Amino acid sequence: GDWSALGKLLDKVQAYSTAGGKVWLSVLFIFRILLLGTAVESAWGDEQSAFRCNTQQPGCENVCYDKSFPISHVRFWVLQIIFVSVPTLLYLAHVFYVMRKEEKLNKKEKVKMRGGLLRTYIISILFKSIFEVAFLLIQWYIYGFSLSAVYTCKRDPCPHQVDCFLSRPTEKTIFIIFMLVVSLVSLALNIIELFYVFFKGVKD
Amino acid sequence: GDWSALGKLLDKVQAYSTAGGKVWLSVLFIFRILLLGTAVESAWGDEQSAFRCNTQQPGCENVCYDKSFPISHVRFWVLQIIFVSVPTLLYLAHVFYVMRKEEKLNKKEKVKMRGGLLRTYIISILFKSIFEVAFLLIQWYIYGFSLSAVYTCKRDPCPHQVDCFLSRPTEKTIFIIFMLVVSLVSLALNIIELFYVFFKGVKD
Amino acid sequence: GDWSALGKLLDKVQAYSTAGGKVWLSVLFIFRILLLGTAVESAWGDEQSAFRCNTQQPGCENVCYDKSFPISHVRFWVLQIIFVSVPTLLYLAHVFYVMRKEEKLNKKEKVKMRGGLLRTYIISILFKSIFEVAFLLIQWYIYGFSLSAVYTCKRDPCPHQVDCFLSRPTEKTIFIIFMLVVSLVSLALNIIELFYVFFKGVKD
Amino acid sequence: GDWSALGKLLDKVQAYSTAGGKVWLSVLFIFRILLLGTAVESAWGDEQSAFRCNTQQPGCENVCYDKSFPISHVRFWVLQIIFVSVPTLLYLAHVFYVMRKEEKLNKKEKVKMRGGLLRTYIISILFKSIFEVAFLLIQWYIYGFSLSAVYTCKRDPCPHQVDCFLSRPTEKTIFIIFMLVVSLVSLALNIIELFYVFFKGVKD
Amino acid sequence: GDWSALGKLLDKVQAYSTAGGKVWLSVLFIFRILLLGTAVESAWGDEQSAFRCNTQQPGCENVCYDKSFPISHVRFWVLQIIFVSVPTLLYLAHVFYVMRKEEKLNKKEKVKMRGGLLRTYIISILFKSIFEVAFLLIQWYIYGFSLSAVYTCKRDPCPHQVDCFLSRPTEKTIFIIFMLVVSLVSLALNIIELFYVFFKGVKD
Amino acid sequence: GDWSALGKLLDKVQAYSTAGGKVWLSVLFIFRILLLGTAVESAWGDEQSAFRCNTQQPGCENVCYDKSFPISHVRFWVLQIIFVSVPTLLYLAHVFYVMRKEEKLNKKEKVKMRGGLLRTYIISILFKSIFEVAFLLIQWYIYGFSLSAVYTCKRDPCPHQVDCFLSRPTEKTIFIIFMLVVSLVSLALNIIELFYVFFKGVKD
């Protein structure tokens, strides 16, 4: 899919944010949206075609593939990258609205966070952090962080137990670890950014 | 398909609309057209190929797949997103026409909704609301909001009853719930926007 | 295929046409070219692969698929949208030529249809109307407006009669009805536009 | 393939050519390059996959498909549209070179075909005409203008005679007739353009 | 693949090169990069799928297809078009560097090849010529300029000799001849260009 | 995938870097990102489909294909081209920040590496070199630089030993050698660039 919608929006916020916001925008840009279109989208290509279980009964393969995979991981990461990118837009909307109000009000005759922009900023960073830890918790709860080559399936209308074999488990586990460590360092960067901003705000 | 037709049209209306109109345009932009191209278009890929019923008779699979699915859900959502996006264009057309008439008439020597723009605005929001509830009612009438893995098919030229097995029911039900809740909060946002505008119009 | 050839041409005519011409250009833009790329192009994907007749003889399927379908409907609509879009270009060419001649002639020292532009306008609308009714008549003559799921085929080198089963008849009939009603309201809009223009031309 | 190479070149010649050159550029633009990307490129999709002959011998199908088709028609039309578009570029190159020489020479202190531009113009139109009739003659010599559904193949390593069945003969014959009549009216337009230009050149 | 990297680079050299350089850039533009994306990329589509040898042993087909084809021809032409396009970039780099040095040095208070630009020019043309004849020599050494329909394969783990049948030999031989004659006239154009430039350089 | 993210970033650094940095940016541009989209992405197309081992047991092919290939080479090169392109961005970020600070500070009333830019420059080149040699060492440790046509597989649930046959080993080994020699000359260029810069820095 095309990812040139947000760019004409995240570029405009890359004019009047702090340096930690700029480097977080840069890592979100170059390490997630770029990685998702390039290679990790190709690896999930032959998802259901190469999947195979050892039986002769018709239609058991679809049920076992369903029970193994509630969702593919790519659409999970896309929902994650949508939900971590909503709650920073309203900060841009608020500063754009108050800049418009400033340019309206001053003519009846820089950037400095004061008054309420601190509040919007900290609740935006808090929402980003809690969405991050929520998505990571859900991914650990459902899938874990390893994929075995052999799966045991125990669902109707198949007989008692069947064995199924995936396709490319190693590469997928590698990319799962990679997206995990990217999410981890993004959370750590947000935490140290909020810590530095609060320290400078109590220092001034 | 390409979705860069309307953008050169919905951008121009994102200059002189109210804030509720701006946030509704933003959610229609980022949560529907972006979601439709990215991931939910991929999941309906192997629609008819992976579909399978348990028989030996030729050609029964096409009839049972037809009787199960009158339309795919993606084309239904595309028709929905067309019909909720027509009746806001004529508001832009009317304000563009009267702005042209203003710029023609004033030289023979902002934005403020007065006279008839209230009427066009409220009938546009009313048409959007009734189209929304009509599409949601039709989707509840035909499909429901859950998909069973096993379907029973009872059509000629197949014998009496046959069983059919779909592909990925869980992920599709998840995305159905997701589009449902997006439509619900869009309707609620339109209702509270019209309520606020009528309250300010009787307040002034 | 790419549809960004005409746009740099139909945009230029969307500067100096009447309001009925503008709304006809808008409906031709948003309801045909947009609909053709998005969803109805996907539904004709597995056209010949899913087609199947009940025999054991090799090669009968191609002959029966040929006799059922002289052309696919999508290429028929593309030829229709080409032939309804040629005879409006020469109006733009004529007004561009006479505007160039005006800008050449005036310097040797708006828009108002006078002299011959009425003639070009009415013959353009007449050609559009007769091409519309010709294409609709041909589509009714060959295909009708419904598709049965079962077809009886009676051609060599197959034996006497064979039965064939299509793929997704319901969705295709829905989209056929949709393109029909779009063509109908386009013809009605052109007729009422010409009626209004002739009434204003005899009123003045 | 992408067809946005020549456009940044045929647009520049659509500033200082005659009206017959402009309408020939317009028909070459809208009726060939647009038609080739949109629909007629889709119809040649399942070219070799759906092709089938009635035997049990391995590998005969490739030899019979080769002997039936020296080239597909689409690549033949692409070579035709390249060879009819080369010998008009050097006219633009010559007028650009002499316009550069004019702008160099005049400062040491419109368009009017005089001197040698007549010669370049008539040899360009002559080369376009002879390439057109050469390509049409070759297409009539090899293929004819009709496709039978059944073909008889008589090549080693197949036994004596075999029968082969194509895919969609009717639609392909329709598009062959269409490209033929487009080429015919292009040749007639070039001839009447050269006739009018020579008549005006002997009239002056 | 996308070929809009070099264009923003070969366009800039199409401002200050000689006329033979301009026509060589034009033929390299319109007859190679355009031809490679359009049609000849489609013909190598079903490369390995339609390939077939007559045996019952598993896996022999991959070994015989490997021994027949060290590389496909398209990737060979892509490497050729990279290696004939590197050694002209440094000429642009040198003239850009010395133009920058001129614009730096003159303000401390056209194009004319003098001093060392002759040397860079002749070694660039020499490198282009020797790379051209090297690639053509290698292509004649490995493949020849004709493809038989039947191939005899003599490799382990297949038994003694097997026969293999290609797909579309005639069309591929046609395009091989076409790329050959394009390379030949490019080499001849470079030779006559260098001859004319040296003749004018000894004439002055 | 799209590779037009970094371009709007590596272009901006191609304004104020040294000549060795410019030619390294040029070779990274034209010989890696261009080569990866064009041809070497096509050759890894039928990766798992054409792979085949000689057995009758179900599902052994996926396990043997997994044990042969931990990752495909293309995604390995993509991770390499990401990790060699991160540690040059912060140099641009630092010079942009200090140029902004210069333009802020000077108004309270070229490029010359002094103070700390030397330090950032040498640690950037050092990080690029060590990442290059690390990736090359890992590729030599896992794969080697040759691919045999026949592989012996010794994993459960297959019986004792099985033989597997790849697809196109020769072309893949050629491209492996090609990417190897490109990486080698990139490392050598970085080394001689740092040597020249340190020699000029101790010369001044």
Side-chain angles (χ1 to χ4, degrees):
Chain A
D2 218 329
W3 286 91
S4 303
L6 295 174
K8 188 75 153 22
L9 313 179
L10 295 174
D11 184 1
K12 292 183 78 63
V13 63
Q14 215 270 320
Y16 18 77
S17 167
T18 185
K22 297 320 188 71
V23 300
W24 177 78
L25 239 306
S26 75
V27 64
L28 170 132
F29 186 80
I30 200 55
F31 258 103
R32 289 189 172 274
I33 326 165
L34 177 63
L35 193 54
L36 248 57
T38 33
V40 85
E41 187 284 323
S42 68
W44 260 256
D46 48 354
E47 256 181 65
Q48 208 177 1
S49 64
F51 183 81
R52 190 174 299 108
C53 315
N54 178 29
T55 59
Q56 299 89 23
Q57 149 77 42
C60 176
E61 311 282 323
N62 289 337
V63 191
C64 286
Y65 167 70
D66 181 65
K67 193 191 171 184
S68 150
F69 287 159
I71 48 179
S72 62
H73 282 49
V74 175
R75 312 187 170 88
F76 184 58
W77 283 313
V78 165
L79 294 190
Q80 173 173 291
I81 212 179
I82 283 302
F83 278 173
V84 302
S85 49
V86 175
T88 177
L89 170 124
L90 92 162
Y91 163 73
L92 161 125
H94 183 210
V95 302
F96 193 83
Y97 152 74
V98 303
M99 193 204 57
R100 149 153 295 180
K101 193 70 65 172
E102 157 175 324
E103 222 50 56
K104 283 156 59 179
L105 258 299
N106 62 337
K107 293 294 129 284
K108 297 175 167 56
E109 317 302 317
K110 49 103 170 180
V111 175
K112 188 175 186 58
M113 170 250 306
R114 278 167 64 184
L117 285 321
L118 177 63
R119 315 165 68 255
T120 64
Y121 212 73
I122 62 177
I123 65 181
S124 62
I125 296 182
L126 236 295
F127 268 18
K128 243 169 52 173
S129 60
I130 63 181
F131 270 29
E132 189 62 46
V133 69
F135 266 83
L136 216 59
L137 295 174
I138 288 185
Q139 186 163 3
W140 177 59
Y141 174 71
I142 292 187
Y143 272 102
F145 301 114
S146 50
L147 298 185
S148 298
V150 188
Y151 175 73
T152 304
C153 178
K154 183 178 179 180
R155 207 165 168 185
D156 298 325
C158 316
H160 343 287
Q161 284 191 2
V162 175
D163 292 336
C164 300
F165 299 143
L166 258 67
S167 178
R168 312 202 197 99
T170 298
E171 172 164 313
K172 295 191 160 198
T173 45
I174 286 169
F175 288 147
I176 279 175
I177 289 176
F178 210 86
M179 300 314 290
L180 169 125
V181 74
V182 160
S183 303
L184 177 63
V185 301
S186 173
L187 188 147
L189 192 135
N190 295 138
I191 284 303
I192 194 178
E193 215 292 320
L194 139 137
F195 169 74
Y196 152 78
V197 164
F198 185 76
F199 164 74
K200 206 62 173 182
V202 303
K203 273 291 296 302
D204 297 333
Chain B
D2 218 329
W3 286 91
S4 303
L6 295 174
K8 188 75 153 22
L9 313 179
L10 295 174
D11 184 1
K12 292 183 78 63
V13 63
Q14 215 270 320
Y16 18 77
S17 167
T18 185
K22 297 320 188 71
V23 300
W24 177 78
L25 239 307
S26 75
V27 64
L28 170 132
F29 186 80
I30 200 55
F31 258 103
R32 289 189 172 274
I33 326 165
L34 177 63
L35 193 54
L36 248 57
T38 33
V40 85
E41 187 284 323
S42 67
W44 260 256
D46 48 354
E47 256 181 65
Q48 208 177 1
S49 64
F51 183 81
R52 190 174 299 108
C53 315
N54 178 29
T55 59
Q56 299 89 23
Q57 149 77 42
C60 176
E61 311 282 323
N62 289 337
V63 191
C64 286
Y65 167 71
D66 181 65
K67 193 191 171 184
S68 150
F69 287 159
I71 48 179
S72 62
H73 282 49
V74 175
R75 312 187 170 88
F76 185 58
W77 283 313
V78 164
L79 294 190
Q80 173 173 291
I81 212 179
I82 283 302
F83 278 173
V84 302
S85 49
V86 175
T88 177
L89 170 124
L90 92 162
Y91 163 73
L92 161 125
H94 183 210
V95 302
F96 193 83
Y97 152 74
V98 303
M99 193 204 57
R100 149 153 295 180
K101 193 70 65 172
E102 157 175 324
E103 222 50 56
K104 283 156 59 179
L105 258 299
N106 62 337
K107 293 294 129 284
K108 297 175 167 56
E109 317 302 317
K110 49 104 170 180
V111 175
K112 188 175 186 58
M113 170 250 306
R114 278 166 64 184
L117 285 321
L118 177 63
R119 315 165 68 255
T120 64
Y121 212 73
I122 62 177
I123 65 181
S124 62
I125 296 182
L126 236 295
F127 268 18
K128 243 169 52 173
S129 60
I130 63 181
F131 270 29
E132 189 62 46
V133 69
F135 266 83
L136 216 59
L137 295 174
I138 288 185
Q139 186 163 3
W140 177 59
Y141 174 71
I142 292 187
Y143 272 102
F145 301 114
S146 50
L147 298 185
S148 298
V150 188
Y151 175 73
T152 304
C153 178
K154 183 178 179 180
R155 207 165 168 185
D156 298 325
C158 316
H160 343 287
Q161 284 191 2
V162 175
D163 292 336
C164 300
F165 299 143
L166 258 67
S167 178
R168 312 202 197 99
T170 298
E171 172 164 313
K172 296 191 160 198
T173 45
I174 286 169
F175 288 147
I176 279 175
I177 289 176
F178 210 86
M179 300 314 290
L180 169 125
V181 74
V182 160
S183 303
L184 177 63
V185 301
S186 173
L187 188 147
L189 192 135
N190 295 138
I191 284 303
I192 194 178
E193 215 292 320
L194 139 137
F195 169 74
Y196 152 78
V197 164
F198 185 76
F199 164 74
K200 206 62 173 182
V202 303
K203 273 291 296 302
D204 297 333
Chain C
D2 218 329
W3 286 91
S4 303
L6 295 174
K8 188 75 153 22
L9 313 179
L10 295 174
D11 184 1
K12 292 183 78 63
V13 63
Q14 215 270 319
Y16 18 77
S17 167
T18 185
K22 297 320 188 71
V23 300
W24 177 78
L25 239 307
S26 75
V27 64
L28 170 132
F29 186 80
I30 200 55
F31 258 103
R32 288 189 172 274
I33 326 165
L34 177 63
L35 193 54
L36 248 57
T38 33
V40 85
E41 187 284 323
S42 68
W44 260 256
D46 48 354
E47 256 181 65
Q48 208 177 1
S49 64
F51 183 81
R52 190 174 299 108
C53 315
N54 178 29
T55 59
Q56 298 89 23
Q57 149 77 42
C60 176
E61 311 282 323
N62 289 337
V63 191
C64 286
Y65 167 71
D66 181 65
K67 193 191 171 184
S68 150
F69 287 159
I71 48 179
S72 62
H73 282 49
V74 175
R75 312 187 170 88
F76 185 58
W77 283 313
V78 164
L79 294 190
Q80 174 173 291
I81 212 179
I82 283 302
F83 278 173
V84 302
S85 49
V86 175
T88 177
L89 170 124
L90 92 162
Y91 163 73
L92 161 125
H94 183 210
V95 302
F96 193 83
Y97 152 74
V98 303
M99 193 204 57
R100 149 153 295 180
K101 193 70 65 172
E102 157 175 324
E103 222 50 56
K104 283 156 59 179
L105 258 299
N106 62 336
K107 293 294 129 284
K108 297 175 167 56
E109 317 302 317
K110 49 104 170 180
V111 175
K112 188 175 186 58
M113 170 249 306
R114 278 166 64 184
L117 285 321
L118 177 63
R119 315 165 68 255
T120 64
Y121 212 73
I122 62 177
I123 65 181
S124 62
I125 296 182
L126 236 295
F127 268 18
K128 243 169 52 173
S129 60
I130 63 181
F131 270 29
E132 189 62 46
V133 69
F135 266 83
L136 216 59
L137 295 174
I138 288 185
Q139 186 163 3
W140 177 59
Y141 174 71
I142 292 187
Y143 272 102
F145 301 114
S146 50
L147 298 185
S148 298
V150 188
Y151 175 73
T152 304
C153 178
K154 183 178 179 180
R155 207 165 168 185
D156 298 325
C158 316
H160 343 287
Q161 284 191 2
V162 175
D163 292 336
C164 300
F165 299 143
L166 258 67
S167 178
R168 312 202 198 99
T170 298
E171 172 164 313
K172 295 191 160 198
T173 45
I174 286 169
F175 288 147
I176 279 176
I177 289 176
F178 210 86
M179 300 314 290
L180 169 125
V181 74
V182 160
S183 303
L184 177 63
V185 301
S186 173
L187 188 147
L189 192 135
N190 295 138
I191 284 303
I192 194 178
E193 215 292 320
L194 139 137
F195 169 74
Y196 152 78
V197 164
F198 185 76
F199 164 74
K200 206 62 174 182
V202 303
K203 273 291 296 302
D204 297 333
Chain D
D2 218 329
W3 286 91
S4 303
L6 295 174
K8 188 75 153 22
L9 313 179
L10 295 174
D11 184 1
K12 292 183 78 63
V13 63
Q14 215 270 320
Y16 18 77
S17 167
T18 185
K22 297 320 188 71
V23 300
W24 177 78
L25 239 307
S26 75
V27 64
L28 170 132
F29 186 80
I30 200 55
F31 258 103
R32 289 189 172 274
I33 326 165
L34 177 63
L35 193 54
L36 248 57
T38 33
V40 85
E41 186 285 323
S42 67
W44 260 256
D46 48 354
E47 256 181 65
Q48 208 177 1
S49 64
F51 183 81
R52 190 174 299 108
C53 315
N54 178 29
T55 59
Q56 298 89 23
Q57 149 77 42
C60 176
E61 311 282 323
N62 289 337
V63 191
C64 286
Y65 167 71
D66 181 65
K67 193 191 171 184
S68 150
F69 287 159
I71 48 179
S72 62
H73 282 49
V74 175
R75 312 187 170 88
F76 184 58
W77 283 313
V78 164
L79 294 190
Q80 173 173 291
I81 212 179
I82 283 302
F83 278 173
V84 302
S85 49
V86 175
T88 177
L89 170 124
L90 92 162
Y91 163 73
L92 161 125
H94 183 210
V95 302
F96 193 83
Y97 152 74
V98 303
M99 193 204 57
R100 149 153 295 180
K101 193 70 65 172
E102 157 175 324
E103 222 50 56
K104 283 156 59 179
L105 258 299
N106 62 337
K107 292 294 129 284
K108 297 175 167 56
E109 317 302 317
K110 49 103 170 180
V111 175
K112 188 175 186 58
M113 170 250 306
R114 278 167 64 184
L117 285 321
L118 177 63
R119 315 165 68 255
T120 64
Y121 212 73
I122 62 177
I123 65 181
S124 62
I125 296 182
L126 236 295
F127 268 18
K128 243 169 52 173
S129 60
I130 63 181
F131 270 29
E132 189 62 46
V133 69
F135 266 83
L136 216 59
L137 295 174
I138 288 185
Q139 186 163 3
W140 177 58
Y141 174 71
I142 292 187
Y143 272 102
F145 301 114
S146 50
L147 298 185
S148 298
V150 188
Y151 175 73
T152 304
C153 178
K154 183 178 179 180
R155 207 165 168 185
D156 298 325
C158 316
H160 343 287
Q161 284 191 2
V162 175
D163 292 336
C164 300
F165 299 143
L166 258 67
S167 178
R168 312 202 198 99
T170 298
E171 172 164 313
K172 295 191 160 198
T173 45
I174 286 169
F175 288 147
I176 279 176
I177 289 176
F178 210 86
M179 300 314 290
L180 169 125
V181 74
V182 160
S183 303
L184 177 63
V185 301
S186 173
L187 188 147
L189 192 135
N190 295 138
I191 284 303
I192 194 178
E193 215 292 320
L194 139 137
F195 169 74
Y196 152 77
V197 164
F198 185 76
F199 164 74
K200 206 62 173 182
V202 303
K203 273 291 296 302
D204 297 333
Chain E
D2 218 329
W3 286 91
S4 303
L6 295 174
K8 188 75 153 22
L9 313 179
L10 295 174
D11 184 1
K12 292 183 78 63
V13 63
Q14 215 270 320
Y16 18 77
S17 167
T18 185
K22 297 320 188 71
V23 300
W24 177 77
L25 239 307
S26 75
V27 64
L28 170 132
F29 186 80
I30 200 55
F31 258 103
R32 289 189 172 274
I33 326 165
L34 177 63
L35 193 54
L36 248 57
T38 33
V40 85
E41 187 284 323
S42 68
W44 260 256
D46 48 354
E47 256 181 65
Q48 208 177 1
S49 64
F51 183 81
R52 190 174 299 108
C53 315
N54 178 29
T55 59
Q56 299 89 23
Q57 149 77 42
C60 176
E61 311 282 323
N62 289 337
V63 191
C64 286
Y65 167 71
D66 181 65
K67 193 191 171 184
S68 150
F69 287 159
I71 48 179
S72 62
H73 282 49
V74 175
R75 312 187 170 88
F76 185 58
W77 283 313
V78 165
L79 294 190
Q80 173 173 291
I81 212 179
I82 283 302
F83 278 173
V84 302
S85 49
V86 175
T88 177
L89 170 124
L90 92 162
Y91 163 73
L92 161 125
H94 183 210
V95 302
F96 193 83
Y97 152 74
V98 303
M99 193 204 57
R100 149 153 295 180
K101 193 70 65 172
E102 157 175 324
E103 222 50 56
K104 283 156 59 179
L105 258 299
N106 62 337
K107 292 294 129 284
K108 297 175 167 56
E109 317 302 317
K110 49 103 170 180
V111 175
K112 188 175 186 58
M113 170 250 306
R114 278 166 64 184
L117 285 321
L118 177 63
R119 315 165 68 255
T120 64
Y121 212 73
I122 62 177
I123 65 181
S124 62
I125 296 182
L126 236 295
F127 268 18
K128 243 169 52 173
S129 60
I130 63 181
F131 270 29
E132 189 62 46
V133 69
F135 266 83
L136 216 59
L137 295 174
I138 288 185
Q139 186 163 3
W140 177 59
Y141 174 71
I142 292 187
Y143 272 102
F145 301 114
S146 50
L147 298 185
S148 298
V150 188
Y151 175 73
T152 304
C153 178
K154 183 178 179 180
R155 207 165 168 185
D156 298 325
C158 316
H160 343 287
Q161 284 191 2
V162 175
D163 292 336
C164 300
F165 299 143
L166 258 67
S167 178
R168 312 202 197 99
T170 298
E171 172 164 313
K172 295 191 160 198
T173 45
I174 286 169
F175 288 147
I176 279 176
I177 289 176
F178 210 86
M179 300 314 290
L180 168 125
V181 74
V182 160
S183 303
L184 177 63
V185 301
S186 173
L187 188 147
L189 192 135
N190 295 138
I191 284 303
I192 194 178
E193 215 292 320
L194 139 137
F195 169 74
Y196 152 78
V197 164
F198 185 76
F199 164 74
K200 206 62 173 182
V202 303
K203 273 291 296 302
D204 297 333
Chain F
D2 218 329
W3 286 91
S4 303
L6 295 174
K8 188 75 153 22
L9 313 179
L10 295 174
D11 184 1
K12 292 183 78 63
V13 63
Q14 215 270 320
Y16 18 77
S17 167
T18 185
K22 297 320 188 71
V23 300
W24 177 78
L25 239 307
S26 75
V27 64
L28 170 132
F29 186 80
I30 200 55
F31 258 103
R32 288 189 172 274
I33 326 165
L34 177 63
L35 193 54
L36 248 57
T38 33
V40 85
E41 187 285 323
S42 68
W44 260 256
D46 48 354
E47 256 181 65
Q48 208 177 1
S49 64
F51 183 81
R52 190 174 299 108
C53 315
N54 178 29
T55 59
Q56 299 89 23
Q57 149 77 42
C60 176
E61 311 282 323
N62 289 337
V63 191
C64 286
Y65 167 71
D66 181 65
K67 193 191 171 184
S68 150
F69 287 159
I71 48 179
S72 62
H73 282 49
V74 175
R75 312 187 170 88
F76 184 58
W77 283 313
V78 164
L79 294 190
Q80 173 173 291
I81 212 179
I82 283 302
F83 278 173
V84 302
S85 49
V86 175
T88 177
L89 170 124
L90 92 162
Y91 163 73
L92 161 125
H94 183 210
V95 302
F96 193 83
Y97 152 74
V98 303
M99 193 204 57
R100 149 153 295 180
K101 193 70 65 172
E102 157 175 324
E103 222 50 56
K104 283 156 59 179
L105 258 299
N106 62 337
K107 293 294 129 284
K108 297 175 167 56
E109 317 302 317
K110 49 103 170 180
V111 175
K112 188 175 186 58
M113 170 250 306
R114 278 166 64 184
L117 285 321
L118 177 63
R119 315 165 68 255
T120 64
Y121 212 73
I122 62 177
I123 65 181
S124 62
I125 296 182
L126 236 295
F127 268 18
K128 243 169 52 173
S129 60
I130 63 181
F131 270 29
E132 189 62 46
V133 69
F135 266 83
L136 216 59
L137 295 174
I138 288 185
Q139 186 163 3
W140 177 58
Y141 174 71
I142 292 187
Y143 272 102
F145 301 114
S146 50
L147 298 185
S148 298
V150 188
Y151 175 73
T152 304
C153 178
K154 183 178 179 180
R155 207 165 168 185
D156 298 325
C158 316
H160 343 287
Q161 284 191 2
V162 175
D163 292 336
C164 300
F165 299 143
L166 258 67
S167 178
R168 312 202 198 99
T170 298
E171 172 164 313
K172 295 191 160 198
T173 45
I174 286 169
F175 288 147
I176 279 176
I177 289 176
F178 210 86
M179 300 314 290
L180 169 125
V181 74
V182 160
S183 303
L184 177 63
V185 301
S186 173
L187 188 147
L189 192 135
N190 295 138
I191 284 303
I192 194 178
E193 215 292 320
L194 139 137
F195 169 74
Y196 152 78
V197 164
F198 185 76
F199 164 74
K200 206 62 173 182
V202 303
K203 273 291 296 302
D204 297 333

